Design a protein around this motif. Sequence first.
Motif, short mmCIF file in Angstrom:
data_model
loop_
_atom_site.label_atom_id
_atom_site.label_comp_id
_atom_site.label_asym_id
_atom_site.label_seq_id
_atom_site.Cartn_x
_atom_site.Cartn_y
_atom_site.Cartn_z
N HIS A 96 -5.42 -20.92 25.51
CA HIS A 96 -4.36 -21.49 24.71
C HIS A 96 -3.43 -22.36 25.50
CE1 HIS A 96 -4.50 -17.22 22.93
NE2 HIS A 96 -5.28 -18.00 22.19
N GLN A 97 -2.93 -23.39 24.81
CA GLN A 97 -1.87 -24.18 25.35
C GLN A 97 -0.72 -23.88 24.41
OE1 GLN A 97 -2.23 -25.39 28.10
NE2 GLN A 97 -0.76 -27.00 28.46
N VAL A 98 0.36 -23.40 25.00
CA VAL A 98 1.53 -22.97 24.25
C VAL A 98 2.50 -24.06 23.84
CG1 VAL A 98 3.72 -21.86 24.68
CG2 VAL A 98 1.61 -20.54 24.72
N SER A 99 2.73 -25.07 24.67
CA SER A 99 3.65 -26.12 24.23
C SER A 99 3.17 -27.50 24.62
CB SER A 99 5.08 -25.86 24.70
OG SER A 99 5.10 -25.52 26.08
N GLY A 100 2.12 -27.92 23.94
CA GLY A 100 1.51 -29.21 24.12
C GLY A 100 0.03 -29.18 23.73
N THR A 101 -0.54 -30.36 23.63
CA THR A 101 -1.93 -30.54 23.29
C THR A 101 -2.81 -30.32 24.50
OG1 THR A 101 -1.95 -32.88 23.92
CG2 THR A 101 -1.18 -32.29 21.72
N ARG A 102 -4.12 -30.36 24.32
CA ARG A 102 -5.03 -30.19 25.43
C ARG A 102 -6.42 -30.78 25.13
NH1 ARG A 102 -2.83 -30.15 29.56
NH2 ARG A 102 -3.98 -29.48 31.41
N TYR A 103 -6.57 -32.07 25.41
CA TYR A 103 -7.83 -32.79 25.23
C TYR A 103 -8.59 -32.61 26.53
CZ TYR A 103 -5.61 -34.81 21.15
OH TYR A 103 -5.03 -34.98 19.90
N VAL A 104 -9.36 -31.54 26.63
CA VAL A 104 -10.05 -31.22 27.88
C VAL A 104 -11.20 -32.20 28.13
CG1 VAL A 104 -11.35 -29.46 29.09
CG2 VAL A 104 -9.43 -28.80 27.63
N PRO A 105 -11.25 -32.85 29.30
CA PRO A 105 -12.34 -33.81 29.55
C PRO A 105 -13.71 -33.16 29.45
CG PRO A 105 -10.70 -33.86 31.35
CD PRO A 105 -10.37 -32.67 30.46
N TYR A 106 -14.73 -33.95 29.13
CA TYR A 106 -16.09 -33.44 28.93
C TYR A 106 -16.67 -32.67 30.12
CZ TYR A 106 -21.11 -33.28 28.09
OH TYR A 106 -22.42 -32.88 27.96
N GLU A 107 -16.56 -33.22 31.33
CA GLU A 107 -17.03 -32.57 32.54
C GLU A 107 -16.39 -31.18 32.74
OE1 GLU A 107 -17.40 -34.67 36.37
OE2 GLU A 107 -17.65 -36.59 35.27
N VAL A 108 -15.10 -31.06 32.46
CA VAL A 108 -14.42 -29.81 32.64
C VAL A 108 -14.87 -28.81 31.60
CG1 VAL A 108 -12.16 -28.65 32.48
CG2 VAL A 108 -12.40 -30.84 33.70
N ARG A 109 -14.88 -29.26 30.36
CA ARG A 109 -15.29 -28.43 29.24
C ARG A 109 -16.69 -27.88 29.47
NH1 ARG A 109 -14.97 -32.05 24.40
NH2 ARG A 109 -17.27 -32.04 24.42
N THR A 110 -17.60 -28.73 29.90
CA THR A 110 -18.99 -28.35 30.13
C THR A 110 -19.14 -27.42 31.34
OG1 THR A 110 -19.52 -30.50 29.19
CG2 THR A 110 -21.30 -29.32 30.32
N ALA A 111 -18.30 -27.61 32.35
CA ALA A 111 -18.27 -26.73 33.52
C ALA A 111 -17.84 -25.35 33.05
CB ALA A 111 -17.27 -27.25 34.54
N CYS A 112 -16.83 -25.28 32.19
CA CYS A 112 -16.41 -23.99 31.68
C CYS A 112 -17.50 -23.30 30.86
CB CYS A 112 -15.13 -24.09 30.86
SG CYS A 112 -13.70 -24.67 31.82
N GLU A 113 -18.22 -24.05 30.03
CA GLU A 113 -19.32 -23.46 29.24
C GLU A 113 -20.32 -22.89 30.23
OE1 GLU A 113 -20.48 -27.16 26.69
OE2 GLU A 113 -20.99 -25.49 25.36
N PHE A 114 -20.59 -23.64 31.29
CA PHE A 114 -21.57 -23.20 32.26
C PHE A 114 -21.16 -21.86 32.91
CE2 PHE A 114 -25.27 -24.41 34.61
CZ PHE A 114 -25.15 -23.72 35.81
N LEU A 115 -19.90 -21.74 33.32
CA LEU A 115 -19.44 -20.52 33.95
C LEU A 115 -19.54 -19.38 32.94
CD1 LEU A 115 -16.35 -21.64 35.97
CD2 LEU A 115 -18.68 -21.37 36.70
N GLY A 116 -19.35 -19.71 31.67
CA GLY A 116 -19.49 -18.72 30.62
C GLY A 116 -20.92 -18.21 30.53
#
Lengths: 304, 304
Positions: free
Chosen positions: A274-294
């Motif tokens: 969660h982002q509590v006070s602001g938006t969060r357009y996570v870049p593709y490379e980061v998002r995909t790295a997180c899926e991978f760690l998952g």
Amino acid sequence: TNCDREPIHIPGAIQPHGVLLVLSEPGLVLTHASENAPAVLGNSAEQLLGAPLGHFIEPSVREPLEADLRSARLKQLNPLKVVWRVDGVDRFFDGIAHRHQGRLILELEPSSHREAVPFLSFFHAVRDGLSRLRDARDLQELCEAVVQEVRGLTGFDRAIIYRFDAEWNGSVIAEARDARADPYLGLHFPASDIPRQARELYQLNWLRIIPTIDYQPARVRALPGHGEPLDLSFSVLRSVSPIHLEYLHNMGVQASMSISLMKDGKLWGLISCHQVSGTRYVPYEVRTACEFLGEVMSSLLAAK
Amino acid sequence: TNCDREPIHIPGAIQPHGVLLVLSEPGLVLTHASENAPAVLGNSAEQLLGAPLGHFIEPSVREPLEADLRSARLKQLNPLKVVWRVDGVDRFFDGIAHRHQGRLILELEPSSHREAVPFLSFFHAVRDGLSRLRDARDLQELCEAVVQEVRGLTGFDRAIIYRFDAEWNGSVIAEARDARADPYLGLHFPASDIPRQARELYQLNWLRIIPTIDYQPARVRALPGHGEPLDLSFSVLRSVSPIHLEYLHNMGVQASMSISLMKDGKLWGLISCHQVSGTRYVPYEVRTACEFLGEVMSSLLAAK
Ligand SMILES: C=CC1=C(C)/C(=C/c2[nH]c(/C=C3N=C(/C=C4\NC(=O)C(C)=C4C=C)C(C)=C\3CCC(=O)O)c(CCC(=O)O)c2C)NC1=O
Ligand SMILES: C=CC1=C(C)/C(=C/c2[nH]c(/C=C3N=C(/C=C4\NC(=O)C(C)=C4C=C)C(C)=C\3CCC(=O)O)c(CCC(=O)O)c2C)NC1=O
């Protein structure tokens, strides 16, 4: 069981920071297009519906993009390099394409940090992350390492591991966060907070992201004869349940991202951010790295 | 136990397809340099020894390279972008640097496919590979998936899983290969074929590569006063045991690459690869993708 009945997979609209197109096969004629195309692509739905995809692509990139979209190994070719050309000017996008229920869906998200070495950040993220996860000596350490890593990569205010029990109730078993976010560590929630149809979908599609909960859903327009509901189960831009957007709002969350954790083919938990006070357009490379760690964490649930 | 006594970590020479330098800290003065520098870098050892590294680096790349070499997070910064400038002409290299026994070692290998999107091949390799490894339902399937994947990425004629038993004897338990390579599946070998000091080293350094067994070792020259043996335990270019080069020769192998498989902190086996009739200079992205899959397999030995 009203919660379980909402058909979240066919909302008829998407989150408007990207564009969604449906393409015929093998011709790649556009049969559907999200109505936010003017703002994002610089073309209207009328210009798009019924036109071949190639008419909009910068020519040196046309053949390869089309070959990829026609390939059976499409899933392994993402992300696609899409250069959209309108009035001699180019706009750059990461294309993510997939096939589901007989439709070929192409989702376009603006390309981020075009000066960074492409995929270098993914390389470091999964290498550093894997070693951190392998150092964990038990399930708790694994959970802690994962949320610390995901928060580090994304900058989310909070990242947790949410574990499901036998009746699908959940428990926050690990948490990493900035000080401005209230701690949810140790809280247990009823199963209905993530209803059945949602859990079923999340067993199949392991990622969801909502960069802002305040958005105007963009309806997906279609050619005459093609207006049946479009199954967006595997669509990154699928507009999410309005009831869930209220839950985030009431929780004080402006943006969210979660990743399914799987074990023996069943949903075991989530990595929720969660982002509590602001938006969060996570870049593709980061998002995909997180899926991978998952996926890595999921593979290690058997052991630790 | 003559086999166990050869000090493989201080041969005083490297494989000549790359260059090895030792750098002082914090000044980055070159105290050692492999004597094949003229052919690879375009400078002699006399020009290099005692000179600061920066004198040879293209200026727009100087500051960052130097900052990286001085960083405590060096291990996470590899590979380094090294652009070597001699007589107004630039040569490109992947720098791999590390610290061991109080020395800062920088190894330089010619940069491959400079027109490919950098790190895109690593991204696909580890994503596709991870899913293939996760589909394995048992230890055999895991072993089979790994050798199939490694062979696919590298083009090696043979890739096997070599598993150690309790007395350090080994067994070929899985194999993927081209038809021109004899099958080694099922063969068992005595422990001495990979002697003790080698196994100890391979518990610490998980990768070794020998792109050709026919090579002139390049001696590492040093400034006066700095001629003690240089501990090359973690050096990618370390010249290997001549006895082992004869073993490969007699086995009909021209090139090799192996990756340690670890379990509970102990060496469990290896992924071993051979090229039977030709050399094999495996690109950095591919090599590193294979190490990564090796780490994944190792993490899954606990489960499957
Ligand atoms: C710390 C705890 C924590 C919880 C519990 C949590 C719940 C949660 N609910 C979700 C979806 C959902 N939640 C609901 C519905 C409901 N929700 C309700 O409380 C009620 C009463 C209903 C309906 C009767 C629905 C429909 C979805 C699906 C959203 C979608 O994918 O479209 C999701 C997935 C989407 C996302 O990642 O934001 C999460 C993570 N998130 C958290 O961080
Ligand atoms: C299919 C089976 C198979 C085997 C068994 C095998 C053995 C093997 N021996 C090795 C190293 C070695 N082997 C030896 C020594 C010996 N070797 C000897 O047969 C004897 C008699 C000695 C010495 C008395 C040494 C010293 C090394 C270390 C090489 C180095 O790292 O410098 C290595 C690591 C380097 C590499 O990857 O090539 C392997 C894989 N490889 C295989 O694919």
